Design a protein around this ligand. Structure first.
Ligand code: NI
Ligand code: NI
Ligand code: NI
Ligand code: NI
Lengths: 833, 833
């Protein structure tokens, strides 16, 4: 067949269309991903037929699926569908804009060529009544306040069209525009940042101009006015205007003034507030729905000065001598700027530009060019050598950190980064019995190998040894080898003696101890394991206990001051299939028999509605500080983030507000998979939050998709993984769009962008050198003096009791009961399976 | 002063002349080295004076030192003295040939400028009555037997001199030589390999010509006769002789025959036998005095076919198409050939060419070009790409192997290679108390460091850990780190428990255990340590015991079948200062007081004339198998070799012959610092003898200096260290000549040429990769099944008793007594201090 790659991919795309076609013919309402596959698939077939032109399919594509055939969110999610195919005259791109352009679509034609029977309308469900919607405050904003202003007559005396961007130095215009060049001096158009005025030939326009800000130095254009704005350089600019024949007619009468903050001043330009949000993303006071949850994030603070937003593109702001600085010291240009980002972080929900330098977050604030703009500090310069990642309208958060990882297969890793995870911590050596049961890399040799194995992958890694030992001998060895933490697991024996010996070792080496307790209460009940901690910091895995630990009351640990507790994700939150699923999963993982009295006793003692319900609440209470996966050993790597938001969404709907928005809950929860995993494991100076001085491990989200599927994963300042369409296409957006590794994941790049975390002892020996690692290696630290109070926004310490028969949990006197949700967000709207 | 390096060196050369001047003024008869410094020094001063010419100094230099002023060896050792100095007309080279050209010299003039009083003749001792002398068998040798021959008239009709080498293809000569070219076809001159016949213009000579050998293929010269010699190529050669105007007159009458082995055949050429030895070094039956000892090596076998010796030089044998082959497959050219070497090695004293390829000894035999010489095998081809090291007249031995090394300072190392040592085995970490007492590199960290440290040094290295332990735990670790052997030392405790635990480990890891027993008999007497061996292989260091062990009878170990025993070198052999030196040395190392009864008791129990006398004998018996240094911890790195021969010289003179030459003794001893240290430590497949397949770690000796100072040290095929004179000079021989590192000692080369030995367990983990070592790393093996019978030529097992009071040693019933020698060879004749 001589299949080129693009042919192979389209076969896949087609397969997805056909599956969507089969669901449609069943009278299922299609989700976003289904609508897309189906339409791209048909477009490709119509091109194969050879009967239809591009202009035709542009129309035909709007009339396949109608409001009736799709889910309530789809008409807002599907802005359009793009695909390329081979027409009779070669490859052509077809864009279908607003494909849900009607009520009924055309079923016959949506299925045409599939040979699937065409369903009747009444086979489809009835329409129900907008993910990531921006709720704009009512009103207008005056651009560019407190600046000298002038209105000038401008003529296009050329024979061709001339168009001028918002930030072009007006004196430097095409010599064929005629106006008062002297009055234009130091001025630029008073219009929304990044648009333009178009002058057809012969046209006369009356233009509102406003003064440039900051240092008021003009660079570029025609070099008419090179230099700082002053009386002396004005005289020189005018000399050059005359000599070089730049169109000039004095307007002695021109209205002059300033942009004053009051009503009906003719120099001022206003921008409708809904429209501000659409161009540049939301600003202070606006709220943003997280994905299709019920959560709203309100912009708390904005660094933007209205009218100088950093937007990149033709005629736009980020151009030489305008928004892009020219003449500052080269070493301080930002490597990359992320423009107009909504940052959601435990430390604040804000609107800001983010500058990246040397793989690090260099600054957060208002960025651009100090020669032309007020308010640009010397650490936020967009310069010649600065790349641009456009955040307008998107959310940025820290890369997620999953601190309960089983390295069972390398593909867990791709699934992780693709969901928004950039750091993994746990143990394993591949698909062995030991690794499948416990987060342990047991032999020094295997430490060596896992570090070397994962050395090119664009994530930060930590590996943990087997902590189950009643003598320190072999623990010293595994830490010296490079383990950055130890796992105490019952399958290797978690006994008071092992617990003690392992914590004494943690005290010496400043590493975290993660524990899965003695479910069987073989050598003690939970109180005996707590006693054995002896007031020493310890991280308790899946603290609720479905995934392991003292039956039935391991959850008591969420009330010990020295315990840092996490949950794993599959019990999150309590939903209608939770219990059934987990019982059987337990039966499967423990090789138990549905028909034996005691097998079923063990399992009913392990998987308990009363405690999972309590887990939803303690999680909302900030009594459980972290959420993690338990990847392929009871939990799900790609669902750390979504299960966090699904827990938040359920609690918002069940419980009281926590402090006219959901900010306090949003920040509490984002902390559970970003900052708190980093604190617990001892590397929070390097990652876990959007703050200056930390790795620029950064995930871009569409608000409509937030918490389900991100756009782009930045690793150490460079794009590591991202949504990507047809590699052969004329743009990146045509089908099939899927998460693929990017330049940050090829060759040596993964290593240059990331950190392998080891113990200080291992680093003292330079295991980075010994092991031949190209990834940066750093030591973990500051882990032996943590208490629950060091967990950001999750420092609650209830008195917990658990009834040994009913399993009912009481916290601070209050019986904890929670309902069984029948659905969750961030699921049916997003996934093809 | 702006001193260049040469100026700095000559200052040292001067200082040596002046010291030699002071000694002469005292009426000391000078040795070789003194004579040289003195004469070069005066020559440089006479040059400074500016009064005398080169030709003058050439005569004056002969009349400074006379037979009276020098030791008996000097007139044979000092063939000449060369130096270069700045005359009024720039730098010029002065060679003084045969500087002892008279009886009285000229004292005043030998001191002139030194302002030292000129001694009178009677202050000098009276003359006494030849180191490395060759004793030639009486007679002649017929060259080139069994070959077609012809005598031809040859005339030089050219106007300039023409000279032809022994192996040039005669038909290929200058076209101005006139002779019968057709008879000359396939012939060459029948003269000694490497010389020539000179034709002045117009001269007529009657030349003996003999047929070429091997395949008889002609290549090179003028391309007259390109091809295998046969009637068809003859016809073509004659065509080209006619066409190209090569001088040709038919000699219809020429005498034709062959080289018969009878007397007075006019076609044959004989070489006087003494002359043969002088040109090509000795052959079968000749004998060579080792240095200035009484030892004589007789050549047991010669591979040469008389007349085809490989000698390289202008006009000589090793030239394109003659002895240097042209047309064989390029991959099989030797990298280097050592021509006409006497090899002295445990396995035989012989005469052979030695072929080196890929740093290994590739072949031993008759080397050359199979197209023109008989007897050249395919693995002995001197090719275009073959380097020549000329061994004619010289002795080649394996690199010495010192297996009792304390790494106290890096300089031990240079002192070792410069004396002829290429492998070191021992322990240490530098000048610490532990390393100054024991051959122990105790920490894994220090193993890594010492291997990294010594990585560029052109010697093979083995490091040994601390074997003193009653538990195996840390012993496992040091071997895994890379130790290739363990040392049990009393200073760390050599108790029966430690001995057992250590040897049990050696059985697991296949490494050698070296021991210095419990001198104090604190824990047991020697019996008890022997019992603790439990029949297991163990290397006993300084088995005599002055250097350490059970007082007074450690020597008993030389009679245990599982013991491999070595001596250190300072007690070798028993001479008049031995006992006095050692008592004090013991006092100093043990911080003892001459005035405390028990300090003097311990000392007298440790240092024992009776046992040291017995050591001379058991050494000669082949009852002690190895001689080693104990470098800087009672022993002397640069004297492993000299002390071995000094011992052999003293026993020759004291005892009966061992099997009309000294071959058996010579071989027995050479094995003590070559093959037996490599067998005992487990790397004898790589080094320790001049045998095919092993590294080309080879030392070139002048017989006159053999066992004192070597000429050249070849490390893995490349010269690593050698005598070198003035780097500014026109030749390499002018003063000051001293041992200097060569190209094998610079940059990356030392590593490329050598091996670091580790345990198999360490190599299993790739410590070579972990430690970033550029030196090749290999594992030691085949060491736990050795018995004294595996020691080459040193396998004797006497029943030994030692009287606890008289210290008298008895071996097989015989009381061992030996005299205190007053002098030793390989000392006063050679050293400047
Ligand atoms: Ni677990
Ligand atoms: Ni787990
Ligand atoms: Ni010793
Ligand atoms: Ni020693």
């Amino acid at each position: 067949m001589k299949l080129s790659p693009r042919e192979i991919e389209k076969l896949g795309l087609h397969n997805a269309g056909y599956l969507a076609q089969k669901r449609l013919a069943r009278g299922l309402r299609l989700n976003y991903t289904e609508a897309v596959a189906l339409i791209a698939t048909q477009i490709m077939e119509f091109v194969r037929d050879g009967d239809k032109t591009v202009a035709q399919l542009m129309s035909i594509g709007r009339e396949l699926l109608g409001r009736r055939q799709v889910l309530p969110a789809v008409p807002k999610l599907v802005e359009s569908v793009q695909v390329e195919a081979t027409f009779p005259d070669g490859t052509e791109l077809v864009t279908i804009h607003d494909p849900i352009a009607c009520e009924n679509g055309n079923l016959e034609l949506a299925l045409l060529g599939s040979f699937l029977p065409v369903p009747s309308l009444d086979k489809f469900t009835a329409n129900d009544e907008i993910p990531g919607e921006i709720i704009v405050v009512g009103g207008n904003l005056v651009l560019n306040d407190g600046r000298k202003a002038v209105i000038l007559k401008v003529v296009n005396n050329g024979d061709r069209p001339v168009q001028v961007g918002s930030h072009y130095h007006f004196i430097e215009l095409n010599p064929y525009l005629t106006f008062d060049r002297r009055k234009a001096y130091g001025m630029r158009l008073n219009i929304a940042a990044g648009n333009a005025s178009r002058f057809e030939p012969g046209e006369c326009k009356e233009v509102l101009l406003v003064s440039i800000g900051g240092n008021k130095v003009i660079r570029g254009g025609n070099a008419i006015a090179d230099g700082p704005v002053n009386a002396s350089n004005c005289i020189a600019a005018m000399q050059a205007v005359i000599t070089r024949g730049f169109g000039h007619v004095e307007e002695a009468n021109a209205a002059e003034g300033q942009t004053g903050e009051d009503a009906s001043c003719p120099f001022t330009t206003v921008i409708s507030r809904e429209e501000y949000a659409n161009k540049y993303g939301p600003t202070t006071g606006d709220k943003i729905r997280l994905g299709d949850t019920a959560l709203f994030a309100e912009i708390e603070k904005d660094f933007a000065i209205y009218g100088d937003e950093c937007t990149f593109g033709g005629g736009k702001v980020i151009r030489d001598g305008m928004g892009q600085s020219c003449g500052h010291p080269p070493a301080l240009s930002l490597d990359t700027v992320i423009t107009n980002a909504v940052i959601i972080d435990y430390s604040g929900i804000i609107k800001a530009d983010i500058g990246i330098k040397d793989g690090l977050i260099h600054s957060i604030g208002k960025s651009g060019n100090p020669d032309v703009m007020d308010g640009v500090f010397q650490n936020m310069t967009t310069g010649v050598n600065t790349e641009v990642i456009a955040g307008e309208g998107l959310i940025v958060t820290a890369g997620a950190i999953d601190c309960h990882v089983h390295y069972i297969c390398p593909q867990l890793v791709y699934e992780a980064v693709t969901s928004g995870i950039t750091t993994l911590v746990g143990g394993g050596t591949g698909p062995t019995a030991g690794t499948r049961a416990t987060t342990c890399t047991p032999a020094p040799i295997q430490m060596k190998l896992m570090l070397q194995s994962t050395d090119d992958l664009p994530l930060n890694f930590g590996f943990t040894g087997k902590g189950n030992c009643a003598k320190p001998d072999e623990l010293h060895e595994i830490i010296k080898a490079g383990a950055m933490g130890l796992k105490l697991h019952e399958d290797w024996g978690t006994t008071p003696a092992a617990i003690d010996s392992c914590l004494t070792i943690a005290e010496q080496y400043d590493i975290q101890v993660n524990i899965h307790t003695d479910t069987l209460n073989e050598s003690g009940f939970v109180e005996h394991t707590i006693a054995a901690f002896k007031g020493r910091t310890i991280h308790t895995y899946h603290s609720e206990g479905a995934g392991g630990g003292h039956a039935p009351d391991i959850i008591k640990v969420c009330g010990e001051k020295n315990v840092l507790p996490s949950s794993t994700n599959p019990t999150r939150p309590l939903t209608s299939n939770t219990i059934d699923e987990h019982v059987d999963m337990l039966m499967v993982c423990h090789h138990l028999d549905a028909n034996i009295a005691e097998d079923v006793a063990f399992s009913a003692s392990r998987i308990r509605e009363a405690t999972i319900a309590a887990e939803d609440i303690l999680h909302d209470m900030g009594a459980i500080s972290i959420i993690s996966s338990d990847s392929q050993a009871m939990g799900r790597i790609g669902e750390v983030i979504s299960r966090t938001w699904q827990t938040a969404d359920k609690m918002k709907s069940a419980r009281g507000p926590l402090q006219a928005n959901d900010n306090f809950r949003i920040k509490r929860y984002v902390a559970k998979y970003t900052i708190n995993p980093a604190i617990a494991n001892g590397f929070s100076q390097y990652v876990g939050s959007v703050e200056v001085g930390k790795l620029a491990d950064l995930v871009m989200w569409k608000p409509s998709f937030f918490g389900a599927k991100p756009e782009m994963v930045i690793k150490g300042g460079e794009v590591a993984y991202a949504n990507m369409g047809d590699p052969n296409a004329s743009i990146p957006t045509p089908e099939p769009v899927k998460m693929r590794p990017m330049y940050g994941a090829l060759g040596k790049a993964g290593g240059a962008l990331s950190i392998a975390f080891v113990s200080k002892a291992a680093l003292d020996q330079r295991v980075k050198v010994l092991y031949g690692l190209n990834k940066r290696v750093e030591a973990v630290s500051n882990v032996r003096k943590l208490t629950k109070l060091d967990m950001k926004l999750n420092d609650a310490l209830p008195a917990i009791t658990v009834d040994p028969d009913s399993y009912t949990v009481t916290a601070d006197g209050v019986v904890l009961t929670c309902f069984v949700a029948t659905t969750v967000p961030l699921s049916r709207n997003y996934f093809i399976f």
